RNA sequence: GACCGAUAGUGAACCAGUACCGUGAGGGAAAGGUGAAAAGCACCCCGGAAGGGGAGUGAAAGAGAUCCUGAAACCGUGUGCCUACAAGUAGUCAGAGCCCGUUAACGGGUGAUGGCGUGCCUUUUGUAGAAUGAACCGGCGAGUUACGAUCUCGUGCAAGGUU
RNA sequence: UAUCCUUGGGAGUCAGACUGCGAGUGAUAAGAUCCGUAGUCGAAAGGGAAACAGCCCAGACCGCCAGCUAAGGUCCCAAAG
RNA sequence: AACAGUGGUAGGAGAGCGUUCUAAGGGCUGUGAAGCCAGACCGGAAGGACUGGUGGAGCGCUUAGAAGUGAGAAUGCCGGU
């Protein structure tokens, strides 16, 4: 029952939940195909962390990858960078650059 | 000397917030709206404590009316006959119990019918 | 004060045209870093009582000490040397456990030097007696030579 | 201590003939029966009434000049759309809803009132298709 | 069964029943009796006018206590008027021993 | 042209119900099946009707 | 020192009259805490790296570099009871069905349906107001001191009190 | 069962509103102004008048699943002919 | 014990709860101090327990005494969302 975390990868959490909803609950082998056939931007990062979790299950616990299914697939939010952008007539509105934490847990069915 | 004082504020607010559990939406989360809801609820509770005494007697009277009409009378005539005959001091609550478990209710009805003439 | 804080006299912005509370100095009591309204100020706390009241108070305290058998009167009270061992032995010899005032008259230096390290005892001259140390010391040692002075002043 | 009831209710089927009775002088006792005011186990939040079926709805009658006086308005939601039809054509063409309107007018408002109305049945002519429920005759006090 | 008149109220009782009524005298383990039977039911109806001559109900005392707490709060909008107050109401717990007649 | 009052959480959550994306339409290849897209040539071994073009 | 303890105390506990703003005279900030000791993670695995999972040091690694404790608004994942014919200042009183078991008590959670019910403060003769104020949460924010008059109470002494 | 003297004079208050009765100004009009007189509101909840400061009944220490009445009412909404 | 009373704004009078520091004395914590988080306890109110978790070194009681003494609103100031 291994896991893997990302911890402050630069992407807005609202846009990553859109894909993590798709991936949750399925079987590990089917999971990667869906992840690399989806055209969004968070798919390579989610695919990388899922591969890391599978590798952790393989080496540290000797669990085999022909049975694993995805049990927990949530996304959190991290610290924010605050910038500025000048508008008309000396106004200087505010811009947010968000971040997120990504966690995946794999378990033997 | 200078006095800081934060824990007192936190405790005093958390008491109200724990008293406002189960309310809809933000009324169980924010202090300002929860306070107002709690005060309104106190006022309502007082008023309704009086009103429940007001509204149980009405149900009692309706059930007695139905049972008496089953026998060939009205509520008003039955009450007049009962108070006029042998001063039955039974209230309406026990009268309804005797209605829902009758054949003892009827005996009092003929007792009143006897004196109504 | 509000006027003593190192700060500004000009006003931060105009009173009309923009929607904001009207504000003068950025060092007003409501701003973060402004002056303290009222607050602690340097002053004195002492005052005085009529003399007969003082005489009555000291008499009453040192006469109530007599009721509880908390007065021991000695004679001479000579120390050959200024050793702290000797004073402790003497105090133990008179069943003294808690604090204890020691009143003499001749301004002894051996008695003052000893018993000044013992964490409970206090040595004073016959003229230096006042209410606090008498009521704050339980036992009261005193010499007859000091008794005469004390009861002859008042 | 007083006994409320729930899922222990029992219903019955009553047939009421409306041949010479006045419109509003029977649609009030019918409403009382529908609500359930004639049972000693009446409870205000449980709907302890019973079904009634009304036959011969075409023979109800009014008094005075109400056969031409009474008017029924049913404004829609469009501008200027206030429709109307008199009581005579209401009786000759739509007797069932003529009775239903009065019965519904004398009933409480809310979900319970709507259920109580659901348990009503109004027919023209003399026969009803409910013989499997084995209904029984009811003689109204008047 | 029987209908009795305890407190300022009227109770209907039978054997083995436990009843909560208003505070009577004091002391637990005592066998109090009521003597205001208005109606003896069962199988030998004895209606009273205004009471049943020669009737009494015996009961046993086994607890004295106070009910749960109620907080009474009232206020008037504007006008700056508040008031808070607490209340717990004492009772007496009894069990019905024998219904005489 | 300016919102009269703030929006609660219930209304926000209710409006977001249709803001989602679906699974792709995909099927495996007869030779070295790699679960490619339908009616497309795969990039490793989903050899479309012959060789694997890319 | 019956003075402060990081929004306090100097404007400044930190490379502060610094950074920034102004042609200039001039105005003027934010920012403390690993551990007793770096003993600051050799080695293996996934990854381009960042970041992780093991293994190790340590009393603690949820203690791992803005590294003592860590609240609230705010954002999520799982689940017990309700919800697609209903008109609601969102509660309160009455009440089945279902799921649980307590600082053992005329217990806890959720609630189909019935009755009653126009937020809070300010100001006015009078406000649900279509009269004013507040996006929300946290911290800070208003009858004091000195010197004179006058009255009550408690003392001390009294035709004498008091330096 | 009160008034009345003193002291703190310790206070606060100085565009009041509507209803019944007697007058003025005015179209002899006003949910208009200005006086004399009683009430309520202000600073008062509960029942009635569909809702409804000032109208009719009546003055809330707290609890009860008890009883008798006031103004107003008794076919259904909605207690009782 | 017996009778009587207990709506309330401006305002007058009385009795109390909590915070920080000082004085007395007394006592508690590494076998776990303060802080934080839950719960189905108690008091007429302002309030006060108990139990479990977290935390990793302080803290309370009684009687006096001092005061930078208690926050929901100022188109309040600062920070986060």
TrEMBL record, chain B:
Coiled coil stretches, renumbered: none
SUPFAM superfamilies listed in its UniProt record: Ribosomal protein L20
GO cellular component: ribonucleoprotein complex; ribosome
Biological process, per Gene Ontology: ribosomal large subunit assembly; translation
Residues of the signal peptide: none
Gene3D superfamilies documented for this protein: 6.10.160.10, Ribosomal protein L20 (1.10.1900.20)
Top-level taxon of origin: Bacteria
Family of the protein in this entry: Belongs to the bacterial ribosomal protein bL20 family.
Protein name: Large ribosomal subunit protein bL20
Organism: Bacillus subtilis
Gene (name only): rplT
Automatic annotation (TrEMBL), chain D:
GO BP term, pick one: negative regulation of translation
Molecular function in Gene Ontology: mRNA binding; structural constituent of ribosome
CDD domains documented for this protein: Ribosomal_L13
Alphabetically ordered keywords of this record: Ribonucleoprotein, Ribosomal protein
Top-level taxon in the UniProt lineage: Bacteria
Family: Belongs to the universal ribosomal protein uL13 family.
Full protein name: Large ribosomal subunit protein uL13
Gene label: rplM
From TrEMBL, chain E:
Keyword Cytoplasm (UniProt): no
One matching Pfam family: Ribosomal_L21p
GO cellular component assignments: cytoplasm; ribonucleoprotein complex; ribosome
Self-association and partners: Part of the 50S ribosomal subunit. Contacts protein L20.
Keyword RNA-binding in annotation: yes
PROSITE patterns attached to this UniProt entry: RIBOSOMAL_L21 (PS01169)
Protein name per the record: Large ribosomal subunit protein bL21
Family: Belongs to the bacterial ribosomal protein bL21 family.
Biological process, per Gene Ontology: translation
Native source species: Bacillus subtilis
Keyword list, A-Z: Ribonucleoprotein, Ribosomal protein, RNA-binding, rRNA-binding
InterPro entries: bL21-like, bL21-like_sf, Ribosomal_bL21, Ribosomal_bL21_CS
Function, as annotated: This protein binds to 23S rRNA in the presence of protein L20.
GO molecular function list: rRNA binding; structural constituent of ribosome
TrEMBL record, chain F:
Entry superkingdom: Bacteria
Pfam families: Ribosomal_L32p (PF01783)
GO BP: translation
One GO cellular component term: large ribosomal subunit
SUPFAM superfamilies linked: Zn-binding ribosomal proteins (SSF57829)
Keyword terms: Ribonucleoprotein, Ribosomal protein
MF terms in GO: structural constituent of ribosome
InterPro entries: Ribosomal_bL32, Ribosomal_bL32_bact, Ribosomal_zn-bd
Family of this protein: Belongs to the bacterial ribosomal protein bL32 family.
Protein name: Large ribosomal subunit protein bL32
Organism per entry: Bacillus subtilis
Gene from which this protein is expressed: rpmF
